[PDB]
């Protein structure tokens, strides 16, 4: 802990955490994220993807759009405050991100992008 | 209509119906299933399989066991009603089965055994 929090997608589409605080006092924060499942990424592929409240379901729309190539992310989506790789089982993968990014009093969600995931797998992120 | 039903799964993981009634007077009943969506089989295929409520748990775990190429489905699962292939994106298919093989008073359910799916994708089918 202290500036990184470590996340879980399962293969029942879960993710192990509904609400992550970053510490204000970090300069930096790290979210690392692995798949203890045993299901393939073409099936059960995850991502951590974070944007405000606001700019998710766009940001999901979108990134159904672009496809399975593009880790279901439009390239280059400007309300991507950060995002990981989609991984399969036993994968892992982190995201640095500065914190000077995020606003005090702005509400902020992170989600999965695979098609359909995000039903299930969202959470809020906050600053502390 | 009425002996037959016309269902669709498509990219957000749902079926367009959640329950099916099948009037006791069919002597047989018809499914066709169609994919309305742009993904493949392999990320977001989907079927149509009925068995009893108690058997559904075991019919979806060892179907996700038998994988893609079993389509989801162990082979010759004695507590399968009836059931589709496992179709992609712009395919269709079609079940007849008898309607003999239900009884009044049993509870059925209808899901796809896509991994992951039947949390969302599964309906009551019942015999009225
Ligand atoms: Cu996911
Ligand atoms: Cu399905």
Redesign the interface.
């Given at each position: 802990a202290e500036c990184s929090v470590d996340i879980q997608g399962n293969?029942?589409?879960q993710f192990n955490t509904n609400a992550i605080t970053v510490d204000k006092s970090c300069k930096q924060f790290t979210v690392n994220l692995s798949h203890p499942g045993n299901?393939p990424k073409?099936?059960?592929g995850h991502n951590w993807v974070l944007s405000t409240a606001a700019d998710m379901q766009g940001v999901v729309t979108d990134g159904?759009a672009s496809g399975?190539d593009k880790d279901y992310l439009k390239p280059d989506d400007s309300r991507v405050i950060a995002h990981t790789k989609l991984i399969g089982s036993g994968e892992k993968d982190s995201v640095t991100f500065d914190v000077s990014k995020l606003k005090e009093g702005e509400q902020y969600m992170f989600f999965c992008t695979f098609?359909?995931h995000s039903?299930?797998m969202k959470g809020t992120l906050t600053l502390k």
């Open positions: 293969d029942q589409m299901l073409n099936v059960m159904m399975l098609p359909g039903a299930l």
